[model samples]
Target: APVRSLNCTLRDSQQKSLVMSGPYELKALHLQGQDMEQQVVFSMSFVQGEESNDKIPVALGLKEKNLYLSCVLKDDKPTLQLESVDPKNYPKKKMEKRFVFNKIEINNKLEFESAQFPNWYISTSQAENMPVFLGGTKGGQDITDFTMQFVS
Candidate 1:
């Protein structure tokens, strides 16, 4: 098996950026040399006022597997809550919910099951096409730096 890699970048509203612009080599040994399997998780924390030490779990699990991820941001409180649901939770129907804050927000949740042969070469190809976001935009224009840690 040949080595594979992925690159990604994350940006905030304050023009601050965290760049993951490099080759993330995939190890065949970790994948058991049969297929490549990987997961990416994201988390965030929001702080406001003088006493700010509240940390929240934003998102988790791999997008290409049987993991369901969802998040919600409170209108008054500066917090981001993330939830992960098992794919088996949804029988056959889709999941939907409505959130009320300053406005009416509707979210449609999709549940994905692991495909046949759960192992496959998962790559982002390059860093330029990675995901980006704007954080801490509820009240004051402050951006909180976030770090992404990868685990197999």
Candidate 2:
């Protein structure tokens, strides 16, 4: 198949805003043959696709646009975060602060691990916060759900 350019971004189920963070993995379901897509796993800095030290957005299906899935760990755990790419450093890239989260899950339903408090999880109600900080349901259904889909 001929290669094409594609932009990747994570949007809430509501499609409100992009999951602006340093990232991990990103799976893209294509607009044509669903088999051809991008699977990005990161192990580097959260910089754009223009930097050498940036995370490898190993392109396989479509190699036009590279994925940026760089994220940083915090407070002993992976805190979901978002920043903007800057140019003051010019060749040296920097991201502007945008948002942050406690954790992200992509198991079945992509959900952010809601905190024990409702202030940060749900912007409106208490139904979103995870029941327990550490899951011990012994496995049943997901407690908190915040899965995001590719809307770019």
Candidate 3:
């Protein structure tokens, strides 16, 4: 298995995508540009007041259970997927396969190079879309321009 590191660039908004690592709600925007009526992608809070039981996958250098991650070959390329967890504790062996990441880490932060594409990492510049990308950067940690830490 040829496992390459990921890109961790700093765009305008870093909270949404796990690319820069903030909260783990799986954030997306309307675009890198919205419908011309929008200024930027935004986030809300406090219903649960800062919590996620959905199990966000993070890299602290070792594997953990709740934040379990799996990357399987999609069309011979890997699509990062989350391990399923069900609150009811049913149908979970299926649910963990649900949120397939299209998107990594640098500077001990995180960087991901896509086997699925040329030079791009997963981004959440789309509010409605939740995860998208910006591209055309040099590899070998070219995406290593941002910060990613576990904060909630």
Candidate 4:
């Protein structure tokens, strides 16, 4: 496996960036062109997976706080959450898989699927300023494609 890192903002088809709204809450918002303060930068650390394909699992850490994105099983649904952890210690913890996501790229856009939930993708609502959640292709309704805009 190869090592790679990325500092970027995730933008959806609606041209909204996933921003940190509250303490550990994620929301999609279309901010003003010069509203750099409102945009959140994520540090993505890619790690080796148990698969034989090109899809490598990644741990997404929120800037400043250093919390990694994790998936929680709530009410029988896989939900997105954040927790403090060192990504370098990957695969050592039994529950660490919940913090990893499988990256699937299509046409330069990326789709993040929960490693714990398999096909459940990290998604956001079409309506602006909505909370980021996990969704499946159930009923053919899903918004999981996102373009990563790398920042300095």
**Top TM-score prediction, candidate number:** 4
Q: For each predicted model, how many residue pairs clash, with residues at least 3 apart or on different chains?
A: 0, 7, 23, 0
Q: Write the per-residue lDDT of candidate 4 for residues 68-134, one digit (tens) a residue.
A: 7888888987888877765465323233688788888867778888988888888888788788888
Supply the TM-score for candidate 1.
0.24
* Candidate 1 stretches greater than 4 Å from native: 1-10, 14-61, 65-78, 89-94, 98-139, 144-152
Against the reference, the lDDT scores of all candidates come to 0.25, 0.28, 0.31, 0.75
TM-scores for all predictions: 0.24, 0.24, 0.30, 0.83
Q: List the residue pairs that clash in candidate 2.
A: 20-82, 21-81, 23-70, 84-95, 84-96, 110-147, 111-146
lDDT score for residue 38 of model 3: 30
Tens-digit lDDT string for candidate 1 (68-103)? 223233575322222335655421122322111111
TM-score of 3: 0.30
Model 2 spans > 4 angstroms off: 1-5, 8-70, 87-152
lDDT of 3 by residue, 36-119 (tens): 223222111111111134312222111222332344555765444434343243222122322222223333343433333434
- Once model 1 is optimally superposed onto the true structure by TM-score, how far is the C-alpha of residue 16 displaced, in angstroms? 6.0
- On the 0 to 100 scale, the lDDT of residue 94 in model 2 is 33
RMSD of candidate 4 to the truth, in angstroms, is 3.2
lDDT of 2 by residue, 59-147 (tens): 21111223322233457543323223332331122322112223334454444222322222322112231111223221334233434
